[PDB]
């Protein structure tokens, strides 16, 4: 298991060693708090700020990770997904 922490946001990713990843997201803040809905069917984690969708995080098997933002309305994905390089570019996605 891996556990990243940014401010009051805790992101936990763990493989159940039989080949099954499942990401969990938790935030302690009481305002502008993040929450995540995990869709194991596509290994996509959707982050919402105060119940409003903001970014999609796809943790594929290839090992890599991608991130894409929703429009201002918070209903659909915009532009094109990007690949996360380092944990310095990954800690931003949790702000």
């Amino acid at each position, epitope marked *: 298991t891996v556990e990243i922490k940014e401010g009051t946001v805790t992101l936990k990713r763990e493989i159940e060693k039989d080949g099954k990843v499942k990401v969990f997201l938790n935030d302690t803040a009481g*305002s*502008n708090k993040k929450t995540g809905k995990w869709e194991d069917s596509t290994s996509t984690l959707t982050i919402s700020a*105060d119940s409003k969708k903001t970014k999609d995080l796809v943790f594929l098997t290839d090992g890599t990770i991608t991130v894409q933002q929703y429009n201002t*309305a918070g209903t659909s994905l915009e532009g094109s997904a990007s690949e996360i390089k380092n944990l310095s570019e990954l800690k931003n996605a949790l702000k």
Partner: antibody
Amino acid sequence: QVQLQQPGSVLVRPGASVKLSCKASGFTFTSSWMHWAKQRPGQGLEWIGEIHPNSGNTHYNEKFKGKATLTVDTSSSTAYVDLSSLTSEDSAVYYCARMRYGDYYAMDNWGQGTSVTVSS
Amino acid sequence: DIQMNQSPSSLSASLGDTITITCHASQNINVWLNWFQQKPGSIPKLLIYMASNLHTGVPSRFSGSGSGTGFTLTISSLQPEDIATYYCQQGQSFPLTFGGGTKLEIKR
């Protein structure tokens, strides 16, 4: 229970400016998304914008950008709209409402509205 | 910038009747559509969200369907308290836009 208080009506001269208030109670204000809309007699509803109280971040309807500015005050749980250099086209009812996301994505609570008159 | 059109623009119906109100959008919005009711000199009231879900407190004789570019509100067994103007609103993308509205009258 969620309540949104707005003054009933206000009179203001042409070219002048006005400040509209909307006091919220019944839910966590800093944790919300407040919206404003206007409705002129028998003309329908026009969307003005949205503000996330916890930061002051806003999203405007381009046709109001220079006319209206949204702001808040976390300490008194109040949302505001400032209208500048009013004209006759500004006379109308202005509503504040709470937008709830999640599985809803709809404005389920509205204020009584403030009837505004632009006359000399 | 989505344009919403409603039809009919107004209608007369008898008590007990079942009426239909349709709303069409400029572009695909998939299911991001709401229905509001406004009685004369009163405030807007949420009826249906995400094109087919009833909002608490609303009589089950109200229902909606559709997706894409067409959505219809159905009102069965028309009651005297249904005398209102109804509006559809898309929340697909900013700015949010409302349809012109459909005014309802009871025929006698």
